[PDB]
């Protein structure tokens, strides 16, 4: 029975009267398709914010409402995968028909699991970005904020992190809060094109939507993520972005009547964000056994990380990926500020092979950037300084990758080892060499019978330096040398190209026979 009635409608909020045991964020039903949550309540009155709207239903003073007595639960349907949905579970875009039976119903405001329910974060999450994989590692169960100014590539970074999971058992959840419908449809098309649609969900709350829906979107998305984690799956969740969520909560609180605080936000904004970014992590086998990785996004104004919301987000997360506008204007893509960025997990979040391959990149980058800045004032530059400028330029060219380009994890490790071992310095500001090397290594470790085993051993075990040197100098180096010589012609005349490549076999004839047979550039040792 409808035990509440509307008495006033101000600022799109509904004031209801009646005798009830109201609770915070309790669901009130105004029809079979319109419901809201409770913000404040007396012993006989309540303030309600609506979640959706109906064209036929016209809420007026005197209308009847039903208090359900329970907080909001989101239902889980089998066709969420490959779909764009509301915060109420309605399919906005879909690829498969719904079975019309809920797998589960999950509270959107659960409490984060305690300390005894956790497990150590020690497995890499392949982002697909060379610099992020090698210098700012992300583990499964980690929270890595992506923070920067407008139009610097944060969304592209998150999308790359989701596209790198094409051949992986990780379920993608993209929550968009206050975004444009055109951008969301573009992201859906990108998912469809790159063959990750069958494993990716989108929870949408556009800027046109109700403020309460934009507030609840991350909670519903991470409730779905927790449902998937409860059955041992690995989930990757992106929130795009949390500044709009904070603004939505501030609007709700200011309209309800809550006293303003710093920057006019409510007094519990930090608790609102922290209680959300603490239910993601790696869990023990008896508590679900899965993991939830989160990649929240934050926008700063003119690179000011001193704002209230960015400070809270930096305080909460396990690490930050800073995107720079100055680096964007210098042609760098992705424009990631390696100096400002940090990853608290460190090597623990890498594989043993990658931890060995990328041991000392930060020092190289730091001294290279210092020398690069000082190069416009000095006149005498040491031989060691020239050599480290050369190595730093090589490293900076290495991490410049195109949009929506996924570079595999072992390929990045091998490129790092080639950089550190000196075989990535013969060129002179040429990128096609790096592209050819990347293609050869990718097809070697993917389209082969022996390269596949080498990729497996590199994934699973941490080898020492001696066997790595054998691996590099016996199979990788001759193939790479032949392919570079066949594609890059003038490189033979380079003194440094031949000084380092004299003690490497000449496999030219066998590989020329291979390519004449029609094999892809980079396959070798066809013993099948």
């Amino acid at each position: 029975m409808k035990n509440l009635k509307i008495t006033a409608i101000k600022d799109n909020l509904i004031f209801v009267e009646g005798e009830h045991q109201f609770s915070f964020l309790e669901i009130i039903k105004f029809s079979d398709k319109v419901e809201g949550v409770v913000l404040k309540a007396n012993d006989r009155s309540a303030i309600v914010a609506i979640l959706n709207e109906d064209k036929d239903l016209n809420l007026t003073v005197g209308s009847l409402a039903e208090a359900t007595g329970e907080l909001y639960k989101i239902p889980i349907y089998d066709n969420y995968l490959g779909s764009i949905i509301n915060v109420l579970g309605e399919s906005l875009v879909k690829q498969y028909e719904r079975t019309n039976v809920a797998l589960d119903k999950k509270y959107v405001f659960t409490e984060a699991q305690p300390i005894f329910t956790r497990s150590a974060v020690n497995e890499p999450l392949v982002t697909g970005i060379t610099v992020v994989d090698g210098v700012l590692p992300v583990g499964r169960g980690q929270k890595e904020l992506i923070i920067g100014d407008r139009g610097t590539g944060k969304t592209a970074i998150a999308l790359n992190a989701m596209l790198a999971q094409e051949n992986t058992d990780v379920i993608n959840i993209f929550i968009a809060i206050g975004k444009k419908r055109d951008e969301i449809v573009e992201i859906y098309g990108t998912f469809k094109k790159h063959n990750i649609l069958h494993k990716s969900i989108i929870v949408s709350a556009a800027s046109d939507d109700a403020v309460a829906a934009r507030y609840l979107a991350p909670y519903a998305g991470m409730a779905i993520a927790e449902f998937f984690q409860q059955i041992g799956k690995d989930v990757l969740v992106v929130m795009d972005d949390l500044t709009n969520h904070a603004d939505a909560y501030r609007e709700l609180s200011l309209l309800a009547g809550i006293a303003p605080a710093r920057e006019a936000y409510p007094g519990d904004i930090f608790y609102v964000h922290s209680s959300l970014l603490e239910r993601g992590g790696k869990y023990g086998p008896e508590f679900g056994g899965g993991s939830i990785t989160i990649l929240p996004i934050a926008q700063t104004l003119a690179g000011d990380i001193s704002g209230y919301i960015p400070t809270n987000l930096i305080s909460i997360t396990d690490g930050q990926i800073y995107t720079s506008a100055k680096l964007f204007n210098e042609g760098t893509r992705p424009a990631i500020d390696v100096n400002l960025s940090v990853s608290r997990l460190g090597s623990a979040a890498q594989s043993k092979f990658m931890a060995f391959a990328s041991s000392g990149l930060k020092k190289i980058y730091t001294e290279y950037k210092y020398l690069k800045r000082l190069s416009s004032f000095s006149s005498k530059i040491s031989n060691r300084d020239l050599e480290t400028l050369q190595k730093g330029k090589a490293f900076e060219s290495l991490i410049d990758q195109a949009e929506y380009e996924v570079i595999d994890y072992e390929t990045s490790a091998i490129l790092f080892l080639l950089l550190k071992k000196g075989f990535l310095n013969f060129y002179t500001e040429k990128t096609e060499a790096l592209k050819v090397i990347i293609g050869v290594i990718k097809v070697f470790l993917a389209k082969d019978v022996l390269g596949r085993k080498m990729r497996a051993i590199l994934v699973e075990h941490g080898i020492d330096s001696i066997v790595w040197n054998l691996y590099l100098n016996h199979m990788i180096l001759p193939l790479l040398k032949y392919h570079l010589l066949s594609e890059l012609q003038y490189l033979a005349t380079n003194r440094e190209f031949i000084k380092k490549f004299k003690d490497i076999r000449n496999d030219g004839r066998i590989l020329l026979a291979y390519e004449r047979k029609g094999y892809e550039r980079g396959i070798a040792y066809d013993y099948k």
Binding site: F24, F270, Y271, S306, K363
Partner: protein, 571 residues
């Protein structure tokens, strides 16, 4: 006299512990294998030593110490009971005397109307609400009239609704404290956070918000700081002395290897000083808390550390109460048991932020930068209970986050009002590969003075700081003009400064699992002598690369002699 009569006093744990303090003579030390000497040295918390002579000398020096000899002599006589002066008293036993119901709800703030009461409600008392087989604590904030109070949740607010019945004893929040708390993980309000079954903690109920002082004058019976705590870390021991019973602010972090710093400190205080450690994690990340707990279990300092974790996902009230609970635990361990305590706070900035959140939620007009009006008074309330008395010293290491590197932020100013020493960790040094990545220029300590240190130490520290500053100034000229653009004296100063900079690096014990190289514990005198020899230029012929991550100057000299000899041998 009779060992049998004595053994009837010491408990089994007490005698097992007292096996540490049994003294070995020089002749006794000589007839040990090198691994036996290593094990004995490790059990006394002095790291590892491959040389037999140095290990024996270190064991003898530690044995030839006033505290060690006192504790060894006391290990033979029967047990002496620590009769306490001004001990902590348990809470009074009461029934539930106030009963009411919730009449107004909000986000984190709930209004309670008292229905049946035998006594008037007092400020800061706790109401208990039992919902769905779980209790929720509501701390009173404002008393509007005889039958109306405002409260904020301590924990999770889920399940509280209009009409929920609440009962109160008219008392503050209380937790169980005893020596059994040592080695377990709890939250500010006593709930268990290390096993699903939630094995109870045995002890007495104490109220952390009650000081239990006879009079205000009793708070002025406090010993001013005079001692210095030794840590075995070269930079801290030489240039940034740590007060005993004071406050030290560890400002910085993030990829600088701060975690290793706090672990190493807890381990060194547990072993080398035979003390008790309390870790109050304010606003502690769940992953970081779990990792710290597991690493404490793995390194063997869990059994002497008491963990109080106020998690990041809890209400502001519990994150506020975390520090007070930690201070109360330290006060129990010092006043009732007489043991010196090393209290750890992480993070102070989050404690200030939680106070600000609570004040803003209760509709109080914000001060500058939106902070609470009572920011400095709350900081004083937290920090004035970390003092030194006759029973023992409570020395506190507090890590603070400086937002956007703004040292003029009100929270930073309030914390700086109390820090006796400051340790500033630099991201630039961490990038350079210098660990433990402590900047020796902008950091300072108030214990570096004639009142507490020998004039030799003072002069060595001053010379080191001046040399490092001059080297830093000359490095820009090096980078721009060149090494041949300096004078001979400036070249010598640059070389000495580089040697000094790289000598201050140290490999930590608690990290040898990863680095694969045994950690070190450099005594203050040995580090002082090493810096004195390096300042004299007596090792300027050795390449700087041999100064990186070493224990002592003797190790540098021996390694250089070995390498060069073997070079010449092949030649």
């Amino acid at each position: 006299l009779d060992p049998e009569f004595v053994a009837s006093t010491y408990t089994e744990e007490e005698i097992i512990h007292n096996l540490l303090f049994k003294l070995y003579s020089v002749e006794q030390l000589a007839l040990f294998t090198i691994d036996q000497l290593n094990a004995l040295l490790f059990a006394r918390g002095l790291g590892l030593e491959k040389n037999k002579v140095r290990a024996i000398k270190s064991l003898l020096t530690l044995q030839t110490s006033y505290e060690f000899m006192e504790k060894s002599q006391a290990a033979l006589l029967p047990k002496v009971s620590f009769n306490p002066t001004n001990p902590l008293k348990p809470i009074e036993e009461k029934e539930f005397t106030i009963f009411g119901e919730i009449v107004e709800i909000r986000s984190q703030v709930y209004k309670i109307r008292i229905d049946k009461a035998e006594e008037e409600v007092l400020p800061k008392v706790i109401f208990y609400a039992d919902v769905n087989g779980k209790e929720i604590q509501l701390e009173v904030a404002d008393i509007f009239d005889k039958n109306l109070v405002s409260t904020f949740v301590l924990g999770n607010e889920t399940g509280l609704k209009i009409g929920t019945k609440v009962k109160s004893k008219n008392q503050s929040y209380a937790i169980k404290i005893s020596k059994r708390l040592l080695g377990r993980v709890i939250d500010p309000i006593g709930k268990i956070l290390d096993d699903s079954i939630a094995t109870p903690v045995h002890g007495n109920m104490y109220a952390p918000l009650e000081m239990q002082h006879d009079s205000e004058a009793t708070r002025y019976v406090v010993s001013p700081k005079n001692a210095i705590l030794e840590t075995g870390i070269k930079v801290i021991d030489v240039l940034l002395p740590i007060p005993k019973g004071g406050k030290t602010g560890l400002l910085g972090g993030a990829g600088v290897g701060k975690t290793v710093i706090v672990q190493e400190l807890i381990n060194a205080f547990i072993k080398f000083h035979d003390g008790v450690s309390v870790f109050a994690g304010i606003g502690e990340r769940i992953r970081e808390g779990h990792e710290l707990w597991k690493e404490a279990e793995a390194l063997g300092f869990l059994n002497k550390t008491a963990f109080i974790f106020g998690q990041m996902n809890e209400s502001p009230g519990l994150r506020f109460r975390s520090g007070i609970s930690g201070v109360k635990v330290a006060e129990y361990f010092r006043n009732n048991l007489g043991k010196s305590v090393l209290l750890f706070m992480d993070n102070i900035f989050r404690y200030v932020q939680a106070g600000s959140e609570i004040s803003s939620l209760l509709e109080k007009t914000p001060s500058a930068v939106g902070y609470q009006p009572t920011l400095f008074s709350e900081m004083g309330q937290l920090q004035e209970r970390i003092n030194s008395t006759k029973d023992g010293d409570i020395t506190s290491i507090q890590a603070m986050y400086i937002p956007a590197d703004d040292f003029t932020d009100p929270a930073a100013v309030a914390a700086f009002a109390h820090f006796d020493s400051t340790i500033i960790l630099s991201r630039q040094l961490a990038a350079e590969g210098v660990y433990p990545a402590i900047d020796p220029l902008e950091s300072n300590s108030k214990m570096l003075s004639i009142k507490y240190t020998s004039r030799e130490h003072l002069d060595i520290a001053k010379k080191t700081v001046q040399t490092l500053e001059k080297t830093k100034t000359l490095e820009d000229i090096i980078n721009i003009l060149g090494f041949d653009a300096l004078s001979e004296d400036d070249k010598k100063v640059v070389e000495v400064g580089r040697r000094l900079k790289w000598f201050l690096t140290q490999p930590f014990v608690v990290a040898e699992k990863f680095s694969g190289v045994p950690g070190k514990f450099v005594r203050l005198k040995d580090s002082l002598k090493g810096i004195k020899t390096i300042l004299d230029g007596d090792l300027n012929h050795i390449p700087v690369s041999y100064f990186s991550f070493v224990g002592v100057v003797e190790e540098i000299i021996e390694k250089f002699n070995l390498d060069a000899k073997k070079e010449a041998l092949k030649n």
